[PDB]
Every structure is written in structure tokens, then in C-alpha cells.
Amino acid sequence: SSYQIAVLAGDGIGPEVMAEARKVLKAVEARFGLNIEYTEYDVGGIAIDNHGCPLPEATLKGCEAADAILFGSVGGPKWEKLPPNEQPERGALLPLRGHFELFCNLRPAKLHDGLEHMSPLRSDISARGFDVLCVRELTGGIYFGKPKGRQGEGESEEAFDTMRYSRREISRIARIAFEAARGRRKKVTSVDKANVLACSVLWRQVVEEVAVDFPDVELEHIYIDNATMQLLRRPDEFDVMLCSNLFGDILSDEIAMLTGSMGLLSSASMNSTGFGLFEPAGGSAPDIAGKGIANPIAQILSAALMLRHSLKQEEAASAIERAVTKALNSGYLTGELLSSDQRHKAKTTVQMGDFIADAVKAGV
Amino acid sequence: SSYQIAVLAGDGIGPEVMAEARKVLKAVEARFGLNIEYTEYDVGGIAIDNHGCPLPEATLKGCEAADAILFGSVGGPKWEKLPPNEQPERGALLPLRGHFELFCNLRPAKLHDGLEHMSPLRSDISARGFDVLCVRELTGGIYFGKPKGRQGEGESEEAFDTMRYSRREISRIARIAFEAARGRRKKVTSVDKANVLACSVLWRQVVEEVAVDFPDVELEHIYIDNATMQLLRRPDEFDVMLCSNLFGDILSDEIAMLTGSMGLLSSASMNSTGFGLFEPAGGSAPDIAGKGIANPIAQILSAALMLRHSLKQEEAASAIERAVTKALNSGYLTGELLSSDQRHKAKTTVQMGDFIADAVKAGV
Ligand SMILES: CC(C)[C@H](C(=O)O)[C@@H](O)C(=O)O
Ligand SMILES: CC(C)[C@H](C(=O)O)[C@@H](O)C(=O)O
Ligand SMILES: [Ca+2]
Ligand SMILES: [Ca+2]
Ligand SMILES: [Cl-]
Numbered sequence A, B: 001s002s003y004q005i006a007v008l009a010g011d012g013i014g015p016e017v018m019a020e021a022r023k024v025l026k027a028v029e030a031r032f033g034l035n036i037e038y039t040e041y042d043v044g045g046i047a048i049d050n051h052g053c054p055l056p057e058a059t060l061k062g063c064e065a066a067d068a069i070l071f072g073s074v075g076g077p078k079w080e081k082l083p084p085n086e087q088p089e090r091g092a093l094l095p096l097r098g099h100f101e102l103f104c105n106l107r108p109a110k111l112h113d114g115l116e117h118m119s120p121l122r123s124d125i126s127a128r129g130f131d132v133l134c135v136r137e138l139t140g141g142i143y144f145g146k147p148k149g150r151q152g153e154g155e156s157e158e159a160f161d162t163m164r165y166s167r168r169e170i171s172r173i174a175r176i177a178f179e180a181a182r183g184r185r186k187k188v189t190s191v192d193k194a195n196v197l198a199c200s201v202l203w204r205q206v207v208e209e210v211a212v213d214f215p216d217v218e219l220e221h222i223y224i225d226n227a228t229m230q231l232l233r234r235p236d237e238f239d240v241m242l243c244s245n246l247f248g249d250i251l252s253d254e255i256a257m258l259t260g261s262m263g264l265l266s267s268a269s270m271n272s273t274g275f276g277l278f279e280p281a282g283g284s285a286p287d288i289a290g291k292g293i294a295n296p297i298a299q300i301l302s303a304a305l306m307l308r309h310s311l312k313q314e315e316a317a318s319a320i321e322r323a324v325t326k327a328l329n330s331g332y333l334t335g336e337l338l339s340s341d342q343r344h345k346a347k348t349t350v351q352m353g354d355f356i357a358d359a360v361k362a363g364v
């Protein structure tokens, strides 16, 4: 019936961009007759300010009462002297993922036509283009493995983290990657360090076991140091990249930055029942906050991921995506998408959201 | 008195490039009156073929009787179906590092003048240039931490690796990085994941403790997912990058590939007594082997690192480096350094070594 969304806009540009996502959602709600109710909750640094911790009890409970979390961004210089476990970004995101079992992170990164010049890639590499989905295991591996901590004092004081995966954890993230490849270009590149790590040995072994169910999908394996090199040089050769938690973290940010256009990229972190956490791929960009400069496209597109993946509102999700395409091909781009001689054509955050929501209303 | 070198040329191009390094060493030996004796030992795939394992007992003992290991490259398709712990690359390199306590890996990567076009970076980024030394902790962390293995069966079978660092391990790699920065551009970027990992919390804490002894060196910290993004985009902003084992592995290969010219880059892995293992940064490139095509500069420069760091032959090391510079500025470049319209000017491996050794002889 009537969906419930926990809106966790966080810090920096999170609120001003979330305002545009919500604006575009309003247009989609009216066009498709969706009944979505939203409640806002403090998270990250504003929650520390307001409630003394990055993930208040009340915010968590709001997320459990929701069908999805629409999440902005967290962190900023203000909290960047806090002891590393009280800090906003890890203190909002890791417990969210752990509590809701959001084991699947999807971060698709593509080079958009006309924006090749912005890619830090050499012009003939960006001109080939790319389109790489990183599928990253989000609730296991070295992030949540135990023992973690430290023992001892002085020179022999040591600290430790345990990277741990079971067959079950690996197979459920691998199926996600194969299924995604199946509807893309039918190739999974599994990324590990199987020459060094026992988790990676089992990782590679299991993802190969999952492959039997996808005889139309090509699987190759690559070590993470090789994957990071190869993506800099021929990112067009990857379709779906399938990674454990630490590796996926590194790789997803790497190809996102290779696009040159992070303010266009969004993220889905989902559990097996369709609940998920939907967010822009970039940070809270505190330096540009409250200035009407941030690109809201990433947050807008996060709301379209939320519609699709949690609310099963595929039409609505697709309408927002095309209203974004339309912006991008009708000269509605924020300042960071424009070369320095074109930076005077920059639209503000409000202008971007206004356009994109008008487009949805107009039947794009 | 008379130095002893264990020559472990390995597989692929390792031998034909090592022949050029040895040729250039002969010229340096004659010019500086150095008495260097060399013994060759099988390692990697040729050792599996010849002795049934990648690091024969006899090879190890040859390395213990040596002042340094001059190491080529290991691995190739031939051994790439072996169970992952019998494989040549990990089976030669990790036990070498562990046995000789080679905790310090130095991999300097710079963009050479005139070779900017080869960098996968966008032209205005490569034109700024860069010069980044990755200092990577090589004997600890998740590579050698215990417990490592697996337990269980079926879906609940799990495997595990332990990332472990002590204050002592961190402080000795950090001093190396600060000392290196001190003689470069006086900045250390320490790379960790302190927002997630207990090893990284202690890592950051300790490297900050080491910093007190280097008040002329700026220290900043960066997370590894951010470091991999930032290096793609503004690699000119880094001087020394200081990393743990897994992270340094990823980062050193990333900036090496950002140079566009891996066949020029070499590696030093050294213990605290000056013994070390010296090797080209790139692999065994099996596809181009025995064809007189491989760039020997990386192996030649590995021999100059060996002279400097193990044999305390600074003059000799410097003479080889300048003979390399001279090649590179006198039109002696192998095929992979030349744009496709200039690829007819390519020199062979023998021609490169001949030139570089002539240059040393001539008093470069
Ligand atoms: C903030 C940090 C814990 C987080 C991660 O490592 O997952 C961030 O890097 C990300 O990619 O969401
Ligand atoms: C082969 C592998 C074990 C090794 C490493 O991870 O150290 C290689 O990647 C390297 O960089 O030397
Ligand atoms: Ca990240
Ligand atoms: Ca490597
Ligand atoms: Cl992991």
C-alpha cells in the first residue's frame, strides 16, 4: 500500500541535494499515483551535534519502520578530530549495513556522452567510454570479521582485524553479480587476492561454483592490484566487477573517479528482502554546502534506485532516470560538469531539481 | 670485499632482461673496480619445472649466501592452473620476503619527460607530471598474519585471514617513508582504512608517533579508497606514500600503471641489515618472451638499486641510472615506449643493454 521512507540526509550538501531528490520524487509520486510518506532523521555529524552519536536509536528505529532509506552523505571537517569509531561516516554507514544485513552494494559507473573531457583518463581512453557495475559484498569480510581490536603495550602492542567469508556469503553476492551481468554485457570479473588470502581462495572457488547457474555469463578472475591497474587503462573491458568488502570499496571509488563525474553516480546497498539504503556515490562535499552549487543528480538518481529496488516502482524509477538524461542533454548541468570555459552556463542545485522534476511532470 | 649475488631470473622475459642487467653490471664492475660474483638459481615456474617447487631449498640457501638477490620475474600461463599456494609468483616472492625479513618495499614511480603520451592519464594531468615513491610494508599485515585458513563444510564453510600489525612493525616502515620524504619533497602520505580497521587505527597512531622525529616532513593520512581516487586525478600532489602490505600492493601497482611506462620502473625489498631483493615492477610478460622485445631498463635499474642499497656502491648505482637516462634521451627506447607511428624506431632488448652498458663504459 503506502510506502514509508526514512530520509537520512546527513551533512554537507546531503540536505540541499536531498531537497531536489524529494522534489523529483513529488513529481514521480503525482505522475504514477504513488503514496510515499517520508520521515527525516538525523544521521552522521548532525546526529552527533543533535543527539551525541552518528546513528541515534530513534534514527535506527525509523529505518526499521521504513521500506527503504534514502540517505544523503555524512562527515566533514567538524567531526574529523573524533576518535575513529565515533566518527560520522563509519558510525552511520557500517551499523546501518550490519543491522539491516545490506550485504549487496551496487555502484554502476559510466562515462556519459559529452562528459568524456571530465574523465581523468587520457582522451582516447575516455572516448572509448566505459560502463562498469561494481558489485561489492557489504556485510562480511574484514569490515565485520572478529577478532578485531588490540592487545599489548609499547613496541609489541598489536592490533588485528579478521577477514572472514563463508560459502553462503560469497554465493549470495556472486549471484547478484551474475544476474546483473546477464542483463548487461554478460561478463563478471571477480576481484580477489587468491594468491595470498585464504578468504580469496574460497572467494574464487565459490564464485566459480555460482557460475554453473549462469552459462550465458563469462566469468574471469583478477587480483585486486591488477584490477586497479587495468581499470585505469582499459575500463571499457569490464562489465560487472564482483568484489569482497575491502576490495569493492577500493574498486568502486576508483572507477567512479575514472568517470570524472561522481555527482552523477548513485549507490544501492540492499538486503535479500528488498529493503535498502540508497545514496550518492560522492561524499558530503562540506566546502560547497548551502551555496546552491552541489549537483543533485546523484541524490535524485538514488531516489530512482530506491523506487526500483525497494518500492518495486520500476516505471517511476525509469521516469526519473530519463528526466536526468534530459537535463544532461538539454544544457542543465551544474558547474563541476562543465569545462572551465563553459562554467558560466552552470545551473544551481535548485535549477537542476526544478528541471528534472518538470521533465517527470511533462511525461519524459 | 668480494660481493656475492643470487641471480633469480625466473620466467617469461626475466632471463633475457636479466642478461642486459648483468651486461650493464659488467661495465659498472670494470669502471668502478667492483668484484661481484654471481650465481644463478631457478625460481618461480622454471623452478617448478626443474625442481618441483617455486622456491627450491638450494635457491633459498643461495640467497642466504648472497649479499643481495637480483630477481627477474615469475609466473606465466603454464603454471596458472596450479592450486593457489603452489603457484610461482606467490610461492617465490612471499617466502623470500618472510625468510629474509624484507619488510621494506620501495617502488618509486615517475612520469618521464617525453613519455607523457604513454601515461593513461588525461593529457593535462600527465603534462603536470608526477613522482611518487610507494613505501610498502612487506612482511606483516594480512599477508603473514595468523590465523589464516578455513574451517567447516558446505554453506557454512568459511575461510579467514588476519591482518595484524605491532607498533614496532609500523614504526620501522614509517621511519623509512619519512627518511625517504626528507630527501625528496618532504611529504609523507600515510594510507590506511582507520575508519574501519583496528590495524589501521594503530597504523595511523604509530606513524604519527614517528612523525615527531621528522619535523621537516609533512604527514597527512588518507584512506585507501580515497588514495586510489586521488592518484588517478592529481598524482602530482603526492611525494611519499606510506602503506601497509595489502594497501601498498594496490597503490604501488596503481601509480606504476599511471606512469604508462612500467618497463622503466624497479623495486627494492629490503631488510634492516641491507640485504635485499631487487626486481622490475612489471610481470614476466610471457607473451613477449625470447623475442628480443622486452624493455630491460627495469631489470637494469633493479641492478642499480642492488648496488646502492645492498652493496653500498652508490657511484656505480648512479652511473647505471644516468646510462638509462641517456638511452631514453638518445632515441634508445624499446617498442612499448613509442607511440604507434614511432614504433618502427624500436630498439631490441640486446640493443638497449648494449647501449646502456656502452654508456657506463664511456663515463656517463
Ligand atoms: C566510510 C567508510 C566506512 C565507507 C566504506 O569503507 O564502506 C565508505 O568508504 C564507503 O565506500 O561507503
Ligand atoms: C604475487 C603477489 C603475492 C605479490 C604481492 O601481492 O605482493 C605481487 O602482487 C607483488 O606486488 O609483488
Ligand atoms: Ca569508499
Ligand atoms: Ca602487486
Ligand atoms: Cl573484505
Ligand SMILES: [Cl-]
Pocket (backbone or CB within 6 Å): B140, B141, B142, B143, B163, B244, B245, B246, B247
Ligand atoms: Cl595488510
